[PDB]
C-alpha cells in the first residue's frame, strides 16, 4: 500500500520439476528417454495468481524446443536420449520489476533398465515493497 | 550416480 511505515517483502514460490523414464524400444527417431518438467507454485499457493504465462526452452534437437504454458499447471513433456540445462521462464504479471525469472534447471536422465526420476526443487522470489497491485496478487497465491 | 548420457553440443558460455 501507499502507507508503509515497515518495509514489507512478498515472496513467492516457484518450483522447478522434473520426471524421466526410459522406454526400452525408443520412438522412431530413436528417443529412448521420456521425461517431462515441471513450473508452478507449492501446494496451496497458486502461482496463476502472480504469474501470466511460461516458456521451457529445451534443446534445438528437439521439434520446437520452446513450449509455452498460459494454462494451469505449466509443463513439458518430451523424449530425447540425453540430459542437459533447461533455461526455463516463468512469466510474471507485473508493470514493475522483472515479468519473468529464468530457472536454469538440470535435466538429468537415468541409465536405461532402471530410470526412478522425480524430482522437484522450489526457488524463492522476494519483493521487497512491491506496489499494491503486485503485493495483492502475490498474497492472493 | 547412474545418469544418462548429456549433450554438450551447446555451450553454456
Same mark, same amino acid.
Given at each position: 500500500?501507499?502507507?508503509?511505515?515497515?518495509?514489507?517483502? $512478498?515472496?513467492?514460490?516457484?518450483?522447478?520439476?522434473?520426471?524421466?523414464?526410459?522406454?526400452?524400444?525408443?520412438?522412431?527417431? @530413436?528417443?529412448?528417454?521420456?521425461?517431462?518438467?515441471? $513450473?508452478?507454485?507449492?501446494?496451496?499457493? *497458486?502461482?496463476?495468481?502472480?504469474?501470466?504465462?511460461? #516458456?521451457?526452452?529445451?534443446?534445438?534437437?528437439? /521439434?520446437?524446443?520452446?513450449? $509455452?504454458?498460459?494454462?494451469?499447471?505449466?509443463?513439458?513433456?518430451?523424449? @530425447?536420449?540425453?540430459?542437459?540445462?533447461?533455461?526455463?521462464?516463468?512469466?510474471?504479471?507485473?508493470?514493475?520489476?522483472?515479468?519473468? $525469472?529464468?530457472?536454469?534447471?538440470?535435466?538429468?536422465?537415468?541409465?536405461?533398465?532402471?530410470? /526412478? #526420476? *522425480?524430482?522437484?526443487?522450489?526457488?524463492? %522470489?522476494?519483493?521487497?515493497?512491491?506496489?499494491?497491485?503486485?503485493?495483492?496478487? %502475490? %498474497?492472493?497465491? | 550416480?547412474?545418469?544418462?548420457?548429456?549433450?554438450?553440443?551447446?555451450?553454456?558460455?
Amino acid at each position: 500500500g501507499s502507507h508503509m511505515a515497515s518495509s514489507c517483502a $512478498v515472496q513467492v514460490k516457484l518450483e522447478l520439476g522434473h520426471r524421466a523414464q526410459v522406454r526400452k524400444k525408443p520412438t522412431v527417431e @530413436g528417443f529412448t528417454h521420456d521425461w517431462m518438467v515441471f $513450473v508452478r507454485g507449492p501446494e496451496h499457493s *497458486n502461482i496463476q495468481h502472480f504469474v501470466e504465462k511460461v #516458456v521451457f526452452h529445451l534443446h534445438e534437437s528437439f /521439434p520446437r524446443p520452446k513450449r $509455452v504454458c498460459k494454462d494451469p499447471p505449466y509443463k513439458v513433456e518430451e523424449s @530425447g536420449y540425453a540430459g542437459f540445462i533447461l533455461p526455463i521462464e516463468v512469466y510474471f504479471k507485473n508493470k514493475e520489476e522483472p515479468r519473468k $525469472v529464468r530457472f536454469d534447471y538440470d535435466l538429468f536422465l537415468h541409465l536405461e533398465g532402471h530410470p /526412478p #526420476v *522425480n524430482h522437484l526443487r522450489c526457488e524463492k %522470489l522476494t519483493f521487497n515493497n512491491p506496489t499494491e497491485d503486485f503485493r495483492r496478487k %502475490l %498474497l492472493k497465491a | 550416480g547412474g545418469k544418462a548420457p548429456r549433450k554438450q553440443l551447446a555451450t553454456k558460455a
